Amino acid sequence: KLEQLARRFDRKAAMRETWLNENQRLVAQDNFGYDLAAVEAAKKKHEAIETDTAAYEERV
Amino acid sequence: TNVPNVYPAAPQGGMAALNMSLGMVTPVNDLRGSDSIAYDKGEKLLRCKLAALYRLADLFGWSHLIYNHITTRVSSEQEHFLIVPFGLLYSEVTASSLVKINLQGDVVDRGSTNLGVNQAGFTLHSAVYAARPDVKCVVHIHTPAGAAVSAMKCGLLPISPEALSLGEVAYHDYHGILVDEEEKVLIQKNLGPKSKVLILRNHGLVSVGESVEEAFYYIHNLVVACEIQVRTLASAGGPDNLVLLDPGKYKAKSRPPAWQIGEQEFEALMRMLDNLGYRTGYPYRYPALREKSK
Amino acid sequence: DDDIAALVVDNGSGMCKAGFAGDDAPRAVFPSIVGRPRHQGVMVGMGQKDSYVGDEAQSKRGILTLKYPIEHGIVTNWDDMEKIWHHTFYNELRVAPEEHPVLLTEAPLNPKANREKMTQIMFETFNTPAMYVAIQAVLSLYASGRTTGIVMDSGDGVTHTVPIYEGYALPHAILRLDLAGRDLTDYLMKILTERGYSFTTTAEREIVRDIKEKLCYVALDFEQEMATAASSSSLEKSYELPDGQVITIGNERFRCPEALFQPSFLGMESCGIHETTFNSIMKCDVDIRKDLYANTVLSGGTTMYPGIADRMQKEITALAPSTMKIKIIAPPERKYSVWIGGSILASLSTFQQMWISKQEYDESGPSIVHRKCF
Amino acid sequence: FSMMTPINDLHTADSLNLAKGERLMRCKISSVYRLLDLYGWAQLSDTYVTLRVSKEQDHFLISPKGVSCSEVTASSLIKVNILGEVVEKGSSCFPVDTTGFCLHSAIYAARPDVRCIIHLHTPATAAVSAMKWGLLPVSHNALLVGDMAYFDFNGEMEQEADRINLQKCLGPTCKILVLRNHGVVALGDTVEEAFYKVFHLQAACEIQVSALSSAGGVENLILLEQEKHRQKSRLGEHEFEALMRMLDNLGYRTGYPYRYPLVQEKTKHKSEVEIPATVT
Amino acid sequence: LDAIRQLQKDHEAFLSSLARAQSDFNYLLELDQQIKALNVPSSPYTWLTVEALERIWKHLSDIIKEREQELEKEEARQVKNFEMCQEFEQNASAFLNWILETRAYFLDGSLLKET
Numbered sequence A: 001k002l003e004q005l006a007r008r009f010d011r012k013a014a015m016r017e018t019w020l021n022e023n024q025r026l027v028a029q030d031n032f033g034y035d036l037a038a039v040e041a042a043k044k045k046h047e048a049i050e051t052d053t054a055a056y057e058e059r060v
Numbered sequence B: 001t002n003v004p005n006v007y008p009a010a011p012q013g014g015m016a017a018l019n020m021s022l023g024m025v026t027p028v029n030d031l032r033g034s035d036s037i038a039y040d041k042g043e044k045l046l047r048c049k050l051a052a053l054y055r056l057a058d059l060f061g062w063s064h065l066i067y068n069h070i071t072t073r074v075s076s077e078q079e080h081f082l083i084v085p086f087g088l089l090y091s092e093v094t095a096s097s098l099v100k101i102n103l104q105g106d107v108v109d110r111g112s113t114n115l116g117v118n119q120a121g122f123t124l125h126s127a128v129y130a131a132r133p134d135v136k137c138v139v140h141i142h143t144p145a146g147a148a149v150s151a152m153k154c155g156l157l158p159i160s161p162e163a164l165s166l167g168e169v170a171y172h173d174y175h176g177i178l179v180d181e182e183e184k185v186l187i188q189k190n191l192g193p194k195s196k197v198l199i200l201r202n203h204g205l206v207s208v209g210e211s212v213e214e215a216f217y218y219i220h221n222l223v224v225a226c227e228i229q230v231r232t233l234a235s236a237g238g239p240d241n242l243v244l245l246d247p248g249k250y251k252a253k254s255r256p257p258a259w260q261i262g263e264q265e266f267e268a269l270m271r272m273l274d275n276l277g278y279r280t281g282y283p284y285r286y287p288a289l290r291e292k293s294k
Numbered sequence C: 001d002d003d004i005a006a007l008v009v010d011n012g013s014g015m016c017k018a019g020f021a022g023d024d025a026p027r028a029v030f031p032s033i034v035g036r037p038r039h040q041g042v043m044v045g046m047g048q049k050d051s052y053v054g055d056e057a058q059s060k061r062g063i064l065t066l067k068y069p070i071e072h073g074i075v076t077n078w079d080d081m082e083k084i085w086h087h088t089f090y091n092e093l094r095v096a097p098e099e100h101p102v103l104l105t106e107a108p109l110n111p112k113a114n115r116e117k118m119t120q121i122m123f124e125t126f127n128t129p130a131m132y133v134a135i136q137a138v139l140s141l142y143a144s145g146r147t148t149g150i151v152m153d154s155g156d157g158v159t160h161t162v163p164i165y166e167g168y169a170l171p172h173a174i175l176r177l178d179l180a181g182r183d184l185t186d187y188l189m190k191i192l193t194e195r196g197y198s199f200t201t202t203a204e205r206e207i208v209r210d211i212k213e214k215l216c217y218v219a220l221d222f223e224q225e226m227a228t229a230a231s232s233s234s235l236e237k238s239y240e241l242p243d244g245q246v247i248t249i250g251n252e253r254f255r256c257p258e259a260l261f262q263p264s265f266l267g268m269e270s271c272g273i274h275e276t277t278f279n280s281i282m283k284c285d286v287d288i289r290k291d292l293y294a295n296t297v298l299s300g301g302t303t304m305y306p307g308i309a310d311r312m313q314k315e316i317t318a319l320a321p322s323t324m325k326i327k328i329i330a331p332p333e334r335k336y337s338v339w340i341g342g343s344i345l346a347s348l349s350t351f352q353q354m355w356i357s358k359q360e361y362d363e364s365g366p367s368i369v370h371r372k373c374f
Numbered sequence D: 001f002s003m004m005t006p007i008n009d010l011h012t013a014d015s016l017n018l019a020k021g022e023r024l025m026r027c028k029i030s031s032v033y034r035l036l037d038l039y040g041w042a043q044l045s046d047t048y049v050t051l052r053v054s055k056e057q058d059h060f061l062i063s064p065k066g067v068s069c070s071e072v073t074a075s076s077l078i079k080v081n082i083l084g085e086v087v088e089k090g091s092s093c094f095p096v097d098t099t100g101f102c103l104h105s106a107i108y109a110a111r112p113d114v115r116c117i118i119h120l121h122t123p124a125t126a127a128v129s130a131m132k133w134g135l136l137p138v139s140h141n142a143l144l145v146g147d148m149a150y151f152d153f154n155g156e157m158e159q160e161a162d163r164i165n166l167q168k169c170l171g172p173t174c175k176i177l178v179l180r181n182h183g184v185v186a187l188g189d190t191v192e193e194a195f196y197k198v199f200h201l202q203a204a205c206e207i208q209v210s211a212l213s214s215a216g217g218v219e220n221l222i223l224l225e226q227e228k229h230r231q232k233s234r235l236g237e238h239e240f241e242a243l244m245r246m247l248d249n250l251g252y253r254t255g256y257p258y259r260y261p262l263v264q265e266k267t268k269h270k271s272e273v274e275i276p277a278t279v280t
Numbered sequence E: 001l002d003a004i005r006q007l008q009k010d011h012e013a014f015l016s017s018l019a020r021a022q023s024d025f026n027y028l029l030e031l032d033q034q035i036k037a038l039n040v041p042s043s044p045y046t047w048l049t050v051e052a053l054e055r056i057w058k059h060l061s062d063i064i065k066e067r068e069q070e071l072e073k074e075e076a077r078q079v080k081n082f083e084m085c086q087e088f089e090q091n092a093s094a095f096l097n098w099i100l101e102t103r104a105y106f107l108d109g110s111l112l113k114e115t
């Protein structure tokens, strides 16, 4: 039973590690839109991403 | 007899002995007299010469994998330039493996190999071929000393008689954009009407010749003069510490079975390469090095 | 041609075969031995010759000292070869040599003086009209129906591997190795002395050779087979000697041929037969490698051990490059194939220009064979 | 009289415990050792190339300590863990040291998208590692390398905090790392791309050393702007097959599978009287 | 049985949550259609569209459809494994009884005395 749940540990941590890599990749690039309207649109999109990450903090 | 299958390697540079051991097995004169409905005697002879030039370029280490290309002209009545297929290593090149293509890159002879040719890599040679009807052999080379010479601001300097023998050098600046037809126009402008040596800045060194021996002579002189310049311009550190040879004064004072101006080195290294065992079938100006014993 | 058929005479190092060209079977196959008496003969009227040749010599093994005229593929007694040729022509076939052409086979790499001496002997004494010399390994591929492939040959003299490319024998890639059947027989004695059975005279060498012929096989895996032989006695078999005694060979059955694959057992520093074939293909150019791996023919007397085919295939697969076409083509009649190839070659109409006339030899001496036959 | 050793020893071993794709990766990294030995870059084992077998099972393959790069084969490779524990040992009777794996271990902990890490100690790359403004893109090959990251190296990374600084300086997306006074490190998803980048950066460093010697100053050189510089074949797919094919022609038993055939192999001339082939 | 017992139980526990899930999903699609009715925003600040949600819903439905058959096969195999085992148990017990009783009667050895 404990070896089975260890192999579940490995299989579970695989997705977490791949996701950490993937949002590393997408927060790496920076492309701000021109002028204040697009800048604040990017700001609220960032806040959407920040609210999204707190969901998987629970899974971690 | 009593020879190893692969030659033992030096502490540095195993490529020389390794390509030697490969050329021990693979002959460069792949043609032995089979059916060839499109080949000519001159075409076959130039194929052998081009394969031998490829192997010689590999042997001196004047090669950067497969990213350099050497083209020749069949001198038929329309187009038909010979180029190495894209993918084969230089020690793998044989006579029948060479690929005949058109000026714009259309493959007229697929050759003995399934590998296609690089369409992007032929446009640089096609610009020179469209620029001059006189040119017949184009060699593009990449040595680290030549790259260091091309990367500096002043470029080649008249410090050796070999650089004086090079003559006027055309310079092509590194655009790095590959803008096709206007890039060809800029090549035609920088190369000029008459020139022997082109330096494509930060990338490579190009020799153009009416014959294979002429291009080999020009590129050998260029490479040796470049590596002459590398040490002495490093040690000098300025014009106050370097003697420059006067070109005009030196050239004014310095000047059939008979050899051409560049056939001597080609024939000597062909003798060397046939003594190695490459069996190139090159027509020598004199069949024996010395007289037969009596 | 129609009236007279060329004589096909195969001179192997251990056996000699003879027949008529265009025929399926050789007429006479006999051992190539010559025996001399070793004891004083006291019976006045029973009749004792000075020397016995061939099967008559092998019938009376107990009173003779058997000598082989061919040693390691090199002739060491030329008048002895005159005796064996006289016995072949006059007794076995009962045909005159002056009325028919003869065909001779030879090792791929032999000294020039050997060819000159064979030509001089065949023209000067036997007065044959026409003769020709052929390479032994080439004719096997003709018998195979092939013109391109690698031929491995192993007789009582020497074992050599050659490549053949549309009938051309490449001289540089021909490889030689001194692992013959006679050395295997000597090693069979050397390993039989462990059990307690002692053989020392040249008469018992034929008994040991018969034991080798009848009771041997090649292990697919040596390490597993030694453990199998140590575990159980199901591998042991019994042989019945000419004097009535019964011996149990047991473990040694797959130890006799193993000297072919690992020559370190015999003290030789050379490589195995599989490495020899691999290096022989390695020495040729790249273009013909694919049709040499895809085409391999085994021939010779030694290559009839049971299980040699699969072991050879596995050992040459282990050295070949990946996804490589590997196949071994061993005919069942693989040690009569040289005579078959010789008769086939003599049967053709365009072969008749190969014959060397008596006038040509008389004009150009014994050295004409090398110029006429390349 | 020969250095030539069959690089594929998987059939003669017939042992060990293997993954479903492990036996091809072993041959590939053994071939990478053979290429880096042949060019004269390295001779003495210092844990140069490391490969990750699987995303989940870890079990990274490294070279044993003490075996020179000429003598490394497929069966001689050692499968170790992320910390240094021995997961599986091949047929190599040598003492096991995983000290050099520590340099690759935190990079494994940092980026998963890399499988192949190649560390160099060549004199040109170590001179560039001591070159304080780093690689100056004055040549085409250095432009082909891409972006670089620079990290100070104190020679030790067993410490728990040094790993954080290393993965901080590496960045989220950067595949070339330059440790100061310690050569260079190249980072690749495949061994082919990593080997291609190693070759190109080595050529660029060799060009740059001669350029800085000959010029004597930055102002004597020309530097094209990084902004101005700014079927499908993968970055190292095309060249690596040619190298494997050439080693196969020489005779090394390279287990690398070729994606397309070399020669057409026109059908030969067939006779009916052939004995049927094979031994079945 | 008992592991597959409790796994059947928490499977039907998961269906009760699936009902809440599809109630929330159709509530969200009605709200998205209400948003889409006025001046057609697809997704103003989020990557998520309606068709991605429909796709992942279909994907989840397909996997639960496969896993109910997987659990059916597992429970069928487990019960088929006990049925012949507990057939074997009573036959073994009767074997033990008769062999011990008959061998004990012959172990007493009173057959040779009373005759």
Ligand SMILES: Nc1ncnc2c1ncn2[C@@H]1O[C@H](COP(=O)(O)OP(=O)(O)O)[C@@H](O)[C@H]1O
Pocket: C011, C012, C013, C014, C015, C154, C155, C156, C157, C181, C182, C209, C212, C213, C214, C300, C301, C302, C304, C305, C335
């Ligand atoms: N049926 C057989 N089984 C095993 N070995 C055999 C058999 N026949 C012949 N041999 C071996 O082959 C040898 C004879 O080889 P042979 O074909 O005469 O050589 P050559 O090619 O010189 O004629 C003998 O020493 C014998 O050991």
